[PDB]
C-alpha cells in the first residue's frame, strides 16, 4: 500500500528534485571551489553570473 | 488529499527566516564553560556523523583488515589492494604532516602514481583523487575530533597569549551557532504553523 | 601660437612625465599582466566556464 | 568484435562522421557560401596601395607647402588629449583658442570669416551653436575640410559640400544631446585647411543666454554656462569673447 | 635655520604633537566618556557612550 | 551556458556589473598617453626646427 | 585575560571595554601626531623656507 502510493505520486517527484538540485550544486562547486593554491579567482564573478 | 492542496505556505517566510537565521548565527561569542561544552557537543556530533560515513566508504574501498583476511578469510580484491597501497602513501604523507591541505599538486599525483607503480601497484590520477578525497576527509574530521578532545581542556593558552600554542578552538563557535540557528529556524517555523497556517488548514 | 610655444613644451615634458606616471601606478597594480581589457577577460571567462 | 578497442574506435569514427554531416554543419556550409560573397569583393579593390601612397605623401613629402605643418600636428595632439580624458582637467593642459559669445551674436559668422568658409551653423535669430565644435585652421592651397571620424573631404569653395558639412555638423551636434535637452559638452573635431588660414585651434561654444526664451528648454541655461566654463577655464587657452554690439549692452551676459 | 628645522628628527615632531594632542582630550575622555560609560550595567551602552 | 555567455558577450555593463574595472580603463589610458606623447614629441621638434 | 573580556559572560567576569577604549584613543593620538608630523616635514617646512 505505502510503496505503491509513494511510487505513483511521490517517488518520481522526489527523484527529479534530488537530481536537478545535485546537478546545480555540483555545477556550482566545479565553478567556485579552488584546487589548492593554484586557483585563479579572476573569473569567479563571471562564473557566478553565468551560473 | 484535498485539504493539503487548498493550503499554501506564506512565501514571505523565506525573507523573515533570512533575518532570523542570521541573528542566531550572529552570536559568535561563547562566554562560559557551559556554552563551550554545548558547542563542542554539537561540533562532535556533526563531525562524527560525516566521519563514520567516510570510514564506511573507506572500509569498502580499501578492504578488510588482516585479522579478517586470516580469521574469516575475507581476502581482498585487486582494487582493494591498490586502494590500500595508495591510502598508505597518502597516509604516510598526512602522518608526517597533519597540516597538509586537501589539494595536492598534479605533479604530486604523478609522483604518487610513480611510487605506487615502482612498488608494484597500478594507479591512475582518478584513483588517487577519489582515494585522496575520502582519506583527507577522514583525516580532517578525525583531527577535528582530536581538537575537540583538546578543546575540552583548553583555556589557559588564551589567558597567556603564549606564542608556541598551536591549539585554536574556533570550529566550536561555528557548530554552536548552527545548533542555535537550527533551534531558531525550527521555532519560527513552528510559530508560523501554530498561529497562522494551522488555523488556515482547519478552515480549508 | 606664442602661448603654444611657451605652454606646449612644458606640458609635453609633463606628458612624458604623465606616461611614466601611468607606468608607475599601472605596473604596481598589474605587474604580471599589462593593459588587460574587460572584453578579453569576458572571453577568457567564457572559455573557462564552458571548460 | 565485442569489447574490442579497435572496433570501438571504428564505431566512434562512423558516429563522428555522421555528426560531421549534421544539419548544423550543412546549414553552416550553406550560410557560409553566401557569407563568402556577402561583405566581400571589397578585398580585391583593397589590395591596391595607391590610397596608401597618397596617405604616405600627406605624412611625409607632400611636395606642397602644406606638408609637415606644425599646427596640423597640434590638431592631432589636442584630439589625443581629448581621447585620453573626457574630463576637462587634462584637456586644459594644452593651449587652444576658446570662443564664447552671446547667443545669436553672429559668432559662427565670425568663425566662418576666420576659417574663410561656410562651415559653421548659420541661421537667422536662433541658437546656432548648441554643442561645441573645435575647428583647427592651417595653411594650404587646397581649401578642404575633413572630420576626425570620417573619410569624406568637403570642398570649401562649393555650396553643396559646404551645406553637407554644415548639416552634418548640426546632426552631430544634436546627437551629442540627450533626448529632451538642447545643449551638450561633447566637442566635434573638424580639420580645415586652406590658403590664408592662420595656425589657430578655435572652439565654438554653446551661446550664453541672459535668460531662457520660452521656446527653448530651461535646461540650457544651467548647461550652457557649465560647458563654457569647462573649456573657458583652461589656464593655457585664449578667450575670444563675441558680444552683440547692436543691442543694449546691459542685456549681454557673455562678459560676466 | 629653516633647513635645520627640516633636519629635526621626525620623532621629535611626533612626540610634541602627540603629547599636546593628548593634553587636549584626556580630561574630556574621562569626563564625557569614561565616567558615564563605566557606570552602565550593559557594556553595549558603555561602548555606545564611547562611540 | 554557451547561450548565456553569448548574452554576456552582448552586454558590456554585464561585464562591469561589479565596479572593479581598473584593468580596462588603465589599459586604455596607457595606450592613449603613449599616443599623446608621441605626437607631442614631433610637435616640439617642429617647434625647434620649423617655428 | 583579554580572553576574559572576550568572554563577556557577566560584569563580575572581566569586562575590559576600558582597556580597548584607551587603546583606541592611543591609536587616534599617535596617528594624528604622525600625520601632522608628515605634513610638517614634507609639505609645510619647504613652504616655510619659500616664505
XYZ file of C-alpha atoms in Angstrom:
715
model
C 0.000 0.000 0.000
C 2.591 2.541 1.083
C 5.111 1.703 -1.640
C 2.553 1.811 -4.447
C 1.125 5.128 -3.269
C 4.609 6.640 -3.000
C 5.711 5.291 -6.386
C 2.566 6.511 -8.124
C 2.506 10.011 -6.634
C 5.776 10.714 -4.767
C 8.944 8.939 -5.873
C 9.131 10.316 -9.460
C 8.719 13.800 -7.935
C 11.371 13.458 -5.228
C 13.902 11.872 -7.582
C 13.838 14.758 -10.057
C 14.252 17.269 -7.238
C 17.255 15.332 -5.950
C 18.856 15.043 -9.382
C 18.391 18.609 -10.604
C 19.483 20.030 -7.245
C 22.518 17.731 -7.381
C 23.451 18.925 -10.858
C 23.000 22.555 -9.826
C 25.137 22.057 -6.714
C 27.987 20.208 -8.444
C 27.855 22.749 -11.279
C 28.295 25.461 -8.649
C 31.142 23.606 -6.930
C 33.227 22.984 -10.060
C 32.960 26.707 -10.817
C 33.941 28.042 -7.379
C 35.974 25.628 -5.248
C 39.737 26.295 -5.538
C 42.052 23.418 -6.434
C 44.583 24.488 -3.844
C 46.977 27.409 -4.053
C 46.976 27.358 -7.878
C 43.381 28.627 -8.166
C 42.818 31.847 -10.139
C 39.689 33.695 -8.978
C 39.798 36.397 -11.686
C 36.726 34.954 -13.448
C 34.851 33.873 -10.307
C 32.455 36.813 -10.637
C 31.737 35.875 -14.250
C 31.330 32.215 -13.283
C 28.775 33.117 -10.611
C 26.931 35.403 -13.025
C 26.775 32.650 -15.666
C 25.629 30.047 -13.140
C -5.521 14.937 -0.309
C -7.848 17.876 -0.934
C -7.171 19.759 2.301
C -3.451 19.772 1.518
C -3.956 21.190 -1.977
C -6.150 24.021 -0.669
C -3.347 25.167 1.671
C -0.242 27.151 0.754
C 2.588 28.308 2.993
C 3.175 32.056 3.106
C 6.270 32.566 0.952
C 7.304 35.724 2.828
C 8.778 33.401 5.454
C 11.818 32.990 3.204
C 12.766 36.607 3.845
C 11.899 36.586 7.545
C 13.927 33.426 8.062
C 16.854 35.093 6.296
C 16.935 37.745 9.007
C 16.133 35.364 11.850
C 18.691 32.780 10.787
C 21.389 35.442 10.564
C 20.641 36.576 14.100
C 21.037 33.077 15.517
C 24.354 32.733 13.712
C 25.310 36.298 14.585
C 26.082 35.278 18.177
C 29.674 34.081 17.791
C 30.523 34.589 21.473
C 30.871 31.581 23.780
C 31.136 33.390 27.103
C 31.471 30.499 29.571
C 32.126 26.791 30.074
C 28.504 25.689 29.636
C 28.140 27.090 26.117
C 31.674 25.932 25.344
C 30.579 22.375 26.145
C 27.314 22.684 24.203
C 29.298 23.981 21.232
C 31.829 21.153 21.430
C 28.980 18.649 21.709
C 27.276 19.809 18.530
C 30.595 20.013 16.675
C 31.486 16.483 17.780
C 28.083 15.136 16.726
C 28.065 16.783 13.299
C 31.651 15.799 12.517
C 31.302 12.245 13.876
C 28.375 11.535 11.560
C 30.407 12.502 8.492
C 33.497 10.729 9.833
C 31.534 7.496 10.225
C 30.209 7.831 6.678
C 33.727 8.436 5.346
C 35.093 5.498 7.345
C 32.439 3.138 5.983
C 33.236 4.291 2.450
C 36.963 3.831 3.076
C 36.475 0.358 4.560
C 34.535 -0.749 1.490
C 37.061 0.929 -0.809
C 40.251 -0.402 0.824
C 39.009 -3.786 2.045
C 39.152 -5.875 5.212
C 41.907 -5.827 7.793
C 44.467 -8.636 8.048
C 42.609 -10.126 11.022
C 39.587 -10.667 8.800
C 41.768 -11.952 5.970
C 43.073 -14.899 8.032
C 40.309 -15.408 10.625
C 37.262 -15.104 8.339
C 39.155 -15.490 5.033
C 37.989 -12.057 3.868
C 40.515 -11.895 1.057
C 40.924 -8.528 -0.638
C 40.225 -7.759 -4.271
C 42.844 -6.316 -6.607
C 41.140 -2.923 -6.463
C 41.108 -3.102 -2.669
C 44.841 -3.859 -2.566
C 45.608 -0.976 -4.939
C 43.431 1.364 -2.889
C 45.151 0.157 0.287
C 48.609 0.969 -1.073
C 47.510 4.385 -2.362
C 45.944 5.075 1.038
C 49.218 4.076 2.692
C 51.062 6.603 0.515
C 48.645 9.433 1.286
C 48.523 8.463 4.955
C 52.274 8.484 5.459
C 52.182 11.954 3.929
C 49.454 13.100 6.329
C 51.040 11.379 9.351
C 54.328 13.168 8.704
C 52.461 16.467 8.191
C 48.911 16.780 9.540
C 48.744 20.369 8.224
C 48.663 19.347 4.567
C 45.687 20.915 2.741
C 43.160 18.960 0.724
C 44.558 19.908 -2.682
C 47.751 18.318 -3.983
C 49.884 19.247 -6.961
C 49.286 17.446 -10.243
C 52.972 16.515 -10.214
C 52.258 15.163 -6.729
C 49.611 12.938 -8.337
C 52.247 11.819 -10.838
C 54.718 11.171 -8.007
C 52.140 9.060 -6.163
C 51.465 7.089 -9.341
C 55.184 6.624 -9.889
C 55.903 5.365 -6.374
C 52.876 3.048 -6.388
C 53.918 1.693 -9.783
C 57.507 1.269 -8.590
C 56.446 -0.827 -5.604
C 54.150 -2.700 -7.995
C 50.745 -1.035 -7.659
C 48.768 0.097 -10.704
C 47.371 3.588 -10.127
C 45.973 6.461 -12.189
C 45.095 10.073 -11.318
C 41.405 9.255 -10.814
C 42.048 6.504 -8.281
C 44.355 8.878 -6.416
C 41.818 11.705 -6.466
C 38.979 9.544 -5.121
C 41.189 7.874 -2.507
C 42.620 11.303 -1.654
C 39.163 12.842 -1.192
C 37.952 10.135 1.181
C 41.261 9.837 3.050
C 41.773 13.567 3.527
C 38.199 13.998 4.722
C 38.732 11.196 7.242
C 41.991 12.802 8.397
C 40.305 16.209 8.554
C 37.323 15.039 10.608
C 39.333 12.839 12.984
C 41.812 15.676 13.515
C 38.822 17.900 14.263
C 37.639 15.406 16.888
C 41.097 15.208 18.461
C 40.936 19.001 18.513
C 37.628 18.510 20.340
C 39.476 16.366 22.871
C 41.962 19.209 23.360
C 39.348 21.999 23.401
C 37.563 20.199 26.231
C 40.539 21.322 28.352
C 41.824 24.435 26.603
C 41.548 27.829 28.289
C 44.997 28.757 29.663
C 46.548 29.377 26.242
C 44.236 32.327 25.625
C 44.780 33.812 29.076
C 48.530 33.793 28.441
C 48.691 34.586 24.691
C 51.500 32.020 24.543
C 53.171 32.071 21.135
C 54.025 28.363 20.713
C 50.369 27.308 21.101
C 49.003 25.573 18.005
C 45.557 24.942 19.518
C 42.901 27.459 18.482
C 39.331 26.327 19.144
C 37.207 28.245 16.622
C 35.229 25.455 14.898
C 33.370 25.135 18.204
C 31.808 28.556 17.608
C 30.574 27.531 14.149
C 28.750 24.441 15.335
C 27.399 26.305 18.372
C 25.981 28.933 16.025
C 24.480 26.308 13.731
C 22.871 24.412 16.608
C 21.264 27.633 17.816
C 20.236 28.554 14.261
C 18.577 25.167 13.820
C 16.664 25.810 17.025
C 15.610 29.304 15.935
C 14.507 28.221 12.456
C 12.507 25.288 13.819
C 10.832 27.502 16.414
C 9.947 30.276 13.959
C 8.502 27.719 11.559
C 6.509 26.159 14.397
C 5.087 29.529 15.412
C 4.069 30.335 11.839
C 2.482 26.881 11.725
C 0.589 27.052 15.014
C -0.769 30.613 14.783
C -1.221 31.250 11.046
C -1.015 28.125 8.915
C -2.704 25.523 11.139
C -5.849 27.642 11.528
C -5.903 28.219 7.766
C -5.636 24.440 7.423
C -8.594 23.963 9.768
C -10.615 26.397 7.649
C -9.618 24.586 4.450
C 50.975 80.402 -31.245
C 53.216 82.268 -28.796
C 51.149 80.796 -25.959
C 51.511 77.417 -27.688
C 55.296 77.623 -27.947
C 55.527 78.587 -24.281
C 52.995 76.137 -22.812
C 53.097 73.053 -25.045
C 56.794 72.367 -24.486
C 56.352 72.484 -20.711
C 53.213 70.360 -20.874
C 54.884 67.946 -23.321
C 57.716 67.352 -20.893
C 54.909 66.967 -18.360
C 53.217 64.449 -20.689
C 56.387 62.402 -20.879
C 56.164 62.614 -17.104
C 52.482 61.664 -17.392
C 53.196 58.481 -19.330
C 55.899 57.490 -16.839
C 53.414 58.348 -14.072
C 50.852 55.988 -15.579
C 53.619 53.390 -15.807
C 54.367 53.880 -12.100
C 50.867 53.107 -10.835
C 49.966 50.596 -13.548
C 52.964 48.305 -13.073
C 52.316 48.192 -9.331
C 48.651 47.390 -9.990
C 49.258 44.650 -12.589
C 52.932 43.639 -12.651
C 52.189 40.210 -14.124
C 49.665 41.422 -16.726
C 49.767 44.597 -18.826
C 46.921 46.517 -20.496
C 44.195 43.940 -19.871
C 40.672 44.653 -21.126
C 37.249 43.633 -19.849
C 36.203 42.111 -23.193
C 39.336 39.952 -23.233
C 38.535 38.971 -19.649
C 34.999 38.001 -20.675
C 36.256 35.788 -23.488
C 38.700 34.104 -21.109
C 35.940 33.560 -18.538
C 33.632 32.138 -21.208
C 36.267 29.610 -22.216
C 36.947 28.655 -18.596
C 33.254 28.292 -17.750
C 32.473 26.135 -20.773
C 35.519 24.042 -19.888
C 34.330 -7.852 -32.128
C 32.519 -7.127 -28.876
C 34.635 -5.456 -26.184
C 37.411 -4.712 -28.694
C 39.177 -1.356 -28.568
C 39.786 -1.093 -32.312
C 36.137 -1.920 -33.013
C 35.110 0.820 -30.575
C 37.396 3.270 -32.379
C 35.861 2.382 -35.752
C 32.341 2.804 -34.357
C 33.328 6.202 -32.956
C 34.717 7.195 -36.359
C 31.414 6.360 -38.058
C 29.398 8.177 -35.384
C 31.600 11.265 -35.671
C 31.345 11.295 -39.472
C 27.550 11.332 -39.289
C 27.786 14.289 -36.897
C 30.195 15.942 -39.339
C 27.409 15.835 -41.936
C 24.789 17.006 -39.430
C 22.166 19.600 -40.350
C 24.006 22.115 -38.159
C 27.145 21.683 -40.268
C 25.142 21.582 -43.511
C 23.365 24.844 -42.687
C 26.734 26.280 -41.677
C 28.090 25.422 -45.132
C 25.041 26.827 -46.931
C 25.101 30.100 -44.977
C 28.893 30.323 -45.277
C 28.675 30.108 -49.064
C 26.543 33.263 -49.143
C 28.717 34.904 -46.473
C 31.834 34.412 -48.618
C 30.120 36.772 -51.080
C 28.351 38.988 -48.522
C 30.599 41.773 -47.208
C 33.059 40.595 -49.814
C 34.507 41.741 -53.227
C 35.895 44.706 -51.275
C 39.136 42.797 -50.698
C 40.334 42.761 -54.317
C 39.970 46.541 -54.530
C 41.571 46.920 -51.090
C 44.846 45.315 -52.200
C 45.763 48.453 -54.162
C 48.314 50.648 -52.374
C 47.620 53.884 -54.290
C 45.449 55.294 -51.496
C 48.159 54.312 -49.029
C 50.742 56.085 -51.194
C 48.667 59.275 -51.089
C 48.418 58.975 -47.304
C 52.201 58.496 -47.144
C 52.626 61.638 -49.234
C 50.484 63.528 -46.737
C 52.531 62.097 -43.857
C 55.941 62.594 -45.489
C 56.789 64.641 -48.590
C 53.513 66.037 -49.919
C 55.544 68.180 -52.393
C 53.411 71.158 -51.317
C 53.883 73.882 -48.727
C 51.093 72.403 -46.609
C 53.270 69.379 -45.818
C 54.525 68.754 -42.276
C 52.615 71.738 -40.896
C 53.201 72.072 -37.157
C 49.665 73.334 -36.455
C 48.456 70.222 -38.283
C 50.253 68.094 -35.687
C 48.904 70.258 -32.868
C 45.392 69.353 -34.010
C 46.193 65.662 -33.531
C 47.809 66.447 -30.175
C 44.645 68.088 -28.862
C 42.486 65.286 -30.275
C 44.555 62.665 -28.431
C 44.346 64.682 -25.211
C 40.567 64.621 -25.632
C 40.722 60.861 -26.178
C 42.833 60.382 -23.038
C 40.332 62.164 -20.769
C 36.689 63.045 -21.306
C 37.068 65.120 -18.141
C 38.125 68.699 -18.816
C 41.128 68.731 -16.470
C 43.611 67.132 -18.874
C 42.203 68.842 -21.967
C 43.026 72.069 -20.120
C 46.689 71.001 -20.065
C 47.348 72.244 -23.593
C 46.540 75.600 -25.227
C 43.672 76.247 -27.631
C 41.526 79.257 -28.542
C 38.081 79.014 -26.921
C 35.415 81.265 -28.463
C 32.398 82.202 -26.346
C 29.684 84.643 -27.310
C 26.221 85.958 -26.643
C 23.515 83.731 -28.083
C 22.732 84.654 -31.697
C 25.520 87.254 -31.688
C 26.811 86.004 -35.058
C 29.739 84.085 -33.539
C 29.532 81.387 -36.218
C 29.808 84.089 -38.883
C 32.981 85.311 -37.164
C 34.344 81.766 -37.083
C 33.451 81.324 -40.762
C 35.258 84.523 -41.741
C 38.304 83.353 -39.787
C 38.023 79.891 -41.376
C 37.137 81.578 -44.705
C 34.376 79.041 -45.375
C 30.682 78.480 -44.639
C 31.461 75.613 -42.269
C 29.541 76.723 -39.163
C 25.776 76.543 -38.500
C 24.285 79.741 -39.914
C 20.746 80.884 -39.173
C 18.672 83.989 -38.569
C 17.704 84.819 -34.995
C 18.166 81.353 -33.497
C 20.609 79.373 -31.393
C 23.390 78.422 -33.806
C 25.908 76.616 -31.570
C 24.405 74.070 -29.169
C 27.293 71.605 -28.849
C 30.856 72.968 -29.001
C 32.785 72.364 -32.229
C 36.585 72.597 -32.407
C 37.925 73.519 -35.863
C 41.681 73.817 -36.427
C 42.917 76.187 -39.136
C 46.161 75.608 -41.061
C 47.599 76.977 -44.298
C 47.268 75.062 -47.559
C 46.459 75.531 -51.257
C 43.524 73.082 -51.015
C 40.568 74.677 -49.215
C 39.212 71.425 -47.785
C 37.617 70.212 -44.549
C 37.752 66.730 -43.020
C 36.127 65.230 -39.938
C 38.125 63.344 -37.335
C 35.623 60.481 -37.549
C 35.063 60.222 -41.318
C 36.771 59.805 -44.685
C 34.717 62.354 -46.651
C 36.548 65.542 -47.574
C 34.430 68.650 -48.114
C 35.393 71.163 -50.795
C 35.034 74.559 -49.132
C 34.687 76.501 -52.407
C 31.399 74.836 -53.426
C 27.997 75.190 -51.799
C 26.890 71.552 -51.981
C 29.796 70.294 -49.862
C 29.630 73.300 -47.534
C 25.929 72.668 -46.881
C 26.539 68.946 -46.400
C 29.277 69.807 -43.900
C 27.114 72.319 -42.025
C 24.160 69.950 -41.750
C 26.371 67.007 -40.769
C 27.802 69.228 -38.027
C 24.240 70.083 -36.992
C 23.320 66.390 -36.860
C 26.428 65.550 -34.821
C 25.611 68.461 -32.500
C 22.118 67.070 -31.969
C 23.451 63.527 -31.496
C 25.629 64.823 -28.655
C 22.473 65.960 -26.794
C 20.195 63.660 -24.811
C 16.551 63.467 -25.848
C 14.541 66.336 -24.384
C 17.617 68.536 -23.884
C 19.176 71.038 -26.275
C 22.824 71.550 -25.259
C 25.764 69.159 -24.693
C 29.522 69.494 -23.967
C 30.827 66.920 -26.443
C 33.212 68.543 -28.921
C 33.132 67.937 -32.678
C 36.583 67.958 -34.310
C 36.983 69.215 -37.885
C 40.377 69.786 -39.521
C 40.117 72.628 -42.045
C 42.918 73.717 -44.374
C 43.056 76.474 -46.959
C 45.018 79.468 -48.225
C 45.367 82.416 -45.875
C 44.351 80.442 -42.788
C 46.369 81.045 -39.647
C 47.709 78.473 -37.205
C 44.641 78.626 -34.850
C 42.644 75.975 -32.967
C 39.182 77.537 -32.497
C 36.472 76.077 -30.247
C 32.910 77.215 -30.880
C 30.849 77.126 -27.686
C 27.091 76.986 -26.945
C 25.756 80.550 -26.961
C 25.217 82.042 -23.495
C 21.777 83.341 -22.505
C 20.836 86.024 -20.006
C 17.569 84.101 -19.613
C 15.923 81.225 -21.451
C 13.392 82.218 -24.051
C 10.069 80.456 -23.613
C 10.516 78.213 -26.648
C 13.921 76.960 -25.531
C 14.197 74.303 -22.855
C 15.127 75.688 -19.407
C 17.930 73.112 -19.088
C 20.192 75.045 -21.421
C 20.735 77.946 -19.036
C 22.467 75.763 -16.462
C 24.024 73.510 -19.097
C 25.338 76.186 -21.465
C 27.424 78.037 -18.905
C 28.871 74.889 -17.345
C 30.012 73.675 -20.760
C 31.554 77.052 -21.484
C 33.419 77.009 -18.184
C 34.752 73.524 -18.959
C 36.609 74.971 -21.941
C 36.976 78.575 -20.758
C 38.861 77.734 -17.545
C 41.798 76.258 -19.479
C 44.758 78.179 -17.973
C 46.637 77.717 -21.273
C 43.855 78.955 -23.580
C 42.856 82.261 -25.158
C 39.328 83.556 -24.560
C 37.708 85.075 -27.646
C 34.626 86.999 -26.474
C 31.912 87.658 -29.072
C 29.372 90.253 -27.912
C 26.366 91.651 -29.776
C 27.067 95.358 -30.253
C 23.765 96.178 -31.989
C 21.688 95.710 -28.807
C 21.505 97.274 -25.369
C 24.736 96.043 -23.806
C 23.005 95.837 -20.413
C 21.262 92.705 -21.723
C 24.532 90.903 -22.536
C 25.820 88.045 -20.381
C 28.969 86.645 -22.059
C 31.254 89.227 -20.446
C 30.346 88.020 -16.950
C 67.840 77.748 10.383
C 64.765 76.808 8.355
C 66.767 73.995 6.763
C 67.878 72.910 10.244
C 64.210 72.863 11.228
C 63.707 70.380 8.318
C 66.545 68.386 9.997
C 64.577 67.977 13.236
C 64.016 64.277 13.738
C 60.502 63.057 12.841
C 60.085 61.510 16.289
C 60.654 64.922 17.873
C 57.781 66.452 15.907
C 55.546 63.435 16.515
C 56.280 63.471 20.254
C 55.394 67.151 20.585
C 52.241 66.697 18.513
C 51.017 63.609 20.377
C 51.708 64.979 23.853
C 49.863 68.200 23.043
C 47.040 66.234 21.401
C 46.579 64.020 24.457
C 46.573 67.030 26.775
C 43.639 68.347 24.729
C 41.281 65.370 25.129
C 42.155 63.232 28.155
C 40.056 65.300 30.552
C 37.216 65.050 28.043
C 37.946 61.340 27.584
C 37.236 60.642 31.246
C 34.661 63.351 31.977
C 32.459 62.809 28.905
C 33.049 59.127 28.028
C 34.622 57.060 30.792
C 32.570 58.230 33.776
C 29.104 57.793 32.173
C 30.181 54.764 30.134
C 31.714 52.787 33.010
C 28.604 53.179 35.200
C 26.404 51.050 32.943
C 25.031 47.582 33.670
C 25.374 46.766 29.955
C 28.737 47.160 28.237
C 26.899 47.859 24.988
C 25.801 51.196 26.432
C 29.338 51.779 27.664
C 30.537 51.415 24.081
C 27.566 53.429 22.810
C 28.545 56.371 25.023
C 32.112 55.896 23.795
C 31.053 55.993 20.158
C 25.912 28.043 -20.836
C 27.196 28.918 -24.304
C 23.982 30.869 -24.915
C 24.260 32.668 -21.566
C 27.896 33.530 -22.262
C 26.847 34.930 -25.635
C 24.411 37.160 -23.744
C 27.436 38.103 -21.627
C 29.183 39.000 -24.889
C 26.342 41.298 -25.916
C 26.269 43.477 -22.774
C 29.313 45.455 -21.648
C 27.640 46.617 -18.444
C 27.117 42.959 -17.602
C 30.913 42.783 -17.740
C 31.399 45.841 -15.322
C 28.401 44.998 -13.082
C 30.919 44.879 -10.230
C 32.860 48.152 -10.217
C 36.406 46.772 -10.213
C 37.073 47.990 -13.765
C 40.595 49.375 -13.291
C 42.014 46.876 -15.805
C 40.285 48.159 -18.942
C 40.429 51.866 -18.114
C 44.114 51.681 -17.186
C 44.970 49.855 -20.414
C 43.125 52.451 -22.484
C 44.805 55.299 -20.610
C 48.267 53.812 -21.129
C 47.775 53.461 -24.879
C 46.273 56.942 -25.244
C 49.015 58.601 -23.174
C 51.615 56.960 -25.400
C 49.869 58.455 -28.431
C 49.710 61.853 -26.699
C 53.428 61.924 -26.044
C 54.319 60.513 -29.466
C 52.518 63.384 -31.181
C 53.850 65.995 -28.751
C 57.428 64.881 -29.443
C 57.174 65.607 -33.167
C 55.337 68.843 -32.405
C 58.143 70.041 -30.128
C 60.851 69.033 -32.604
C 58.978 71.055 -35.227
C 58.979 73.974 -32.785
C 62.761 73.628 -32.537
C 63.197 73.431 -36.324
C 60.197 74.886 -38.179
C 58.584 77.556 -35.985
C 42.966 37.980 30.435
C 41.941 39.769 27.278
C 40.052 36.498 26.713
C 38.013 37.050 29.872
C 36.982 40.299 28.191
C 36.196 38.376 25.006
C 34.008 36.074 27.100
C 31.793 38.975 28.238
C 29.935 36.471 30.378
C 28.979 38.825 33.225
C 30.105 42.020 34.965
C 31.875 40.009 37.671
C 33.896 38.354 34.929
C 36.388 40.780 33.445
C 34.612 43.444 31.381
C 37.553 45.334 29.886
C 35.988 47.741 27.445
C 38.109 50.303 29.296
C 41.432 48.956 28.030
C 40.159 48.775 24.454
C 38.879 52.357 24.752
C 42.224 53.711 25.904
C 43.924 51.642 23.198
C 41.667 53.144 20.539
C 42.479 56.675 21.655
C 46.156 55.669 21.851
C 45.921 54.867 18.150
C 43.989 58.042 17.385
C 46.521 60.294 19.116
C 49.592 58.551 17.700
C 48.274 58.562 14.132
C 47.195 62.201 14.424
C 50.668 63.135 15.652
C 52.390 61.255 12.832
C 50.092 62.670 10.137
C 50.729 66.189 11.415
C 54.466 65.496 11.520
C 54.469 64.146 7.968
C 52.628 67.143 6.547
C 55.004 69.366 8.513
C 58.230 67.762 7.312
C 57.274 67.120 3.673
C 54.817 69.943 2.891
C 54.923 72.810 5.382
C 58.660 73.141 6.099
C 59.538 73.625 2.422
C 56.679 76.112 2.049
C 58.109 77.791 5.154
C 61.545 78.031 3.545
C 59.999 79.584 0.435
C 58.049 82.107 2.515
